[PDB]
Amino acid sequence: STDVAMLSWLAALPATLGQVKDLEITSFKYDGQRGEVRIHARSSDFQPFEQARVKLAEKFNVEQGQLNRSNVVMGSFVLKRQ
Amino acid sequence: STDVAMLSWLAALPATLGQVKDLEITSFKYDGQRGEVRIHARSSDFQPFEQARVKLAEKFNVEQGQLNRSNVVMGSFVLKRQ
């Protein structure tokens, strides 16, 4: 019905993404029915995405989306529990 | 460009909405460009929405959306800074 564990742990994401230099979160969505969080972010380079994926992977199932350069690099992440 | 203060304070929303009995968060979205958070939730009654609005209003600019009954009551909130 609705994923409360992801809702709780989502509270750690601002502080976590906050540790990554040159990573701007432009949006993020929690979907309780799927228990996922999807995050869009941008940087001046790819390397902040690598740092973010590795950090998110410690406590989440992370999938990185495509990274595209516009001089901004744009990408996304899908998080699920684990 | 991107609203970091809302990103930070968004971390308090799960714990806050969590205090409200019979309020299920089905989704929520942060938009950094607008610096808003939009939340959809459901309950068995209207009263949890009242409790949630009042609590959110302490630290956010809150607008409650329409509440509609399906036996589930469905509504939403838009939060901005203040």
Structural domains in chain A plus CATH codes: 1-82 (3.30.1360.100)
CA–CA distance, B47 with B5 (Å, rounded to integer) = 29
The two counts, helices (H) then strands (E), for chain B are 3, 5
CA–CA distance, A77 with A28 (Å, rounded to integer) = 9
| B25 touches B48 (CB < 8 A) | no
- Please list, residue by residue across B20-45, b when 16 or more beta carbons sit within 10 angstroms of its beta carbon and e when fewer do: beebbbbbbbbbbeebbbbbbbbbee
Q: Please, which residues have CB within 8 angstroms of residue A31's CB and are 6 or more apart in sequence? A: A37, A38, B26, B27
Q: Give me B61's structure tokens.
A: 């600019």
Could you report how far apart the first and last alpha carbons of chain B are, in Å? 19
* Secondary structure of residue B61 in the 3-state scheme: strand
Task: Show the 3-state SS of chain A.
Answer: CCCHHHHHHHHHHHHHHHCCCCCEEEEEEEECCCCEEEEEEEECCCHHHHHHHHHHHCCEEEEECCCEECCCEEEEEEEEEC
Could you report how far apart the first and last alpha carbons of chain A are, in Å? 19
Contact B28 A24 (CB under 8 A): no
Q: Which amino acid is at A80?
A: K
Q: Give me A80's structure tokens.
A: 């699920």
Pick from B63, B72, B78, B77: nearest CA to B42 = B72
Chain B's closest residue to A1, CA to CA, is B26
Pick from B81, B53, B54, B82: nearest CA to B65 = B53
CA–CA distance, B64 with B53 (Å, rounded to integer) = 7
From chain A, pick out residues whose CB is under 8 angstroms from the CB of B28: 29-30
Q: Which amino acid is at B67?
A: L
Q: Give me A61's structure tokens.
A: 């199932």
- Residue to mutate among A26, A39, A72, A76, with most B CBs inside 10 A, is A26
Q: Which of A7, A14, A27 sits opposite B31 (nearest CB)?
A: A27
For this entry, resolution in Å reads 2.3
